[PDB]
Amino acid sequence: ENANLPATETDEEVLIVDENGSVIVGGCQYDPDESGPIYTKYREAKASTNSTHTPPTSITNIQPYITVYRWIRIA
Amino acid sequence: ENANLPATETDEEVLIVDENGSVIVGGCQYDPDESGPIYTKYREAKASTNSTHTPPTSITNIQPYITVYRWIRIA
Amino acid sequence: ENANLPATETDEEVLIVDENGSVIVGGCQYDPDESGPIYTKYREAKASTNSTHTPPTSITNIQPYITVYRWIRIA
Amino acid sequence: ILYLFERYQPVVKVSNDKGQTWKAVKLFNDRVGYPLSKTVYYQSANTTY
């Protein structure tokens, strides 16, 4: 469950949002026409990794072992 | 496997694609002087975590276990 | 630990940082105004997952106990 | 040696060759300024700002 995890860092760089940040989106695009390509790399948020994951599949523990009937003599 | 994974979200708030966003990209501009630092981050895409290896570390599900000799009675 | 994890992708299109990129963050602002809202997209860096809880949870690797006080006769 | 500033755009160009060749760079990372005369860099006891 999402508690359990190493911390991770993506295998190459990308843009955090910090208010000291180097790169800048500009005060606005200079957008004279509609033909200058619009976009939004959209507002910052959480990252998304496996929301295809709700609670997952669970890798087994007990190891190949004779499953037998322990016979305890009742008394 | 991917479906073995908790629900992951990277901490500090990162930008992503959308059509809804606040962040104007700009598709064209002045980049009249090529002389400005031309910092072009690459495309919107999926950010690979630990892409180096699918074959993770395999946690031993062996539990504290003293191997004890077993010669079963033929009768 | 991050030796144990599969490969993964982010769950959307988000902008990662590379030098073939078709989107150019821009060299600098043609920005004659002052207060038209800009951002600071922070420095492109490794994108940090779960660094709040790095070491976190360690699941139990075993199966339910047949455990009873077992006195093994010396001889 | 030889910092030059734009009125607005943060990109500045710097030369150590005394103008023989120019090189463009960031590091202003703001709108810089539009002072009403000339001077922008003003400094005392090191601590240039």
Side-chain angles (χ1 to χ4, degrees), chain A residues 3 6-7 21 26-27 32 36-37 45 47 55-56 64 75, chain B residues 3 6-7 21 26-27 32 36-37 45 47 55-56 64 75, chain C residues 3 6-7 21 26-27 32 36-37 45 47 55-56 64 75, chain D residues 1-5 8 10-15 17 19 21-22 24-25 27 29-30 32-40 42-45 47-49:
Chain D
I1 296 172
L2 291 177
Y3 298 138
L4 57 75
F5 296 163
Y8 291 139
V11 176
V12 298
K13 299 174 67 177
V14 176
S15 292
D17 292 345
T21 300
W22 292 96
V25 69
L27 77 83
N29 77 347
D30 274 339
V32 66
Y34 176 77
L36 59 79
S37 302
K38 292 304 289 185
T39 187
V40 174
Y42 192 80
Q43 64 188 25
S44 67
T47 59
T48 183
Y49 58 85

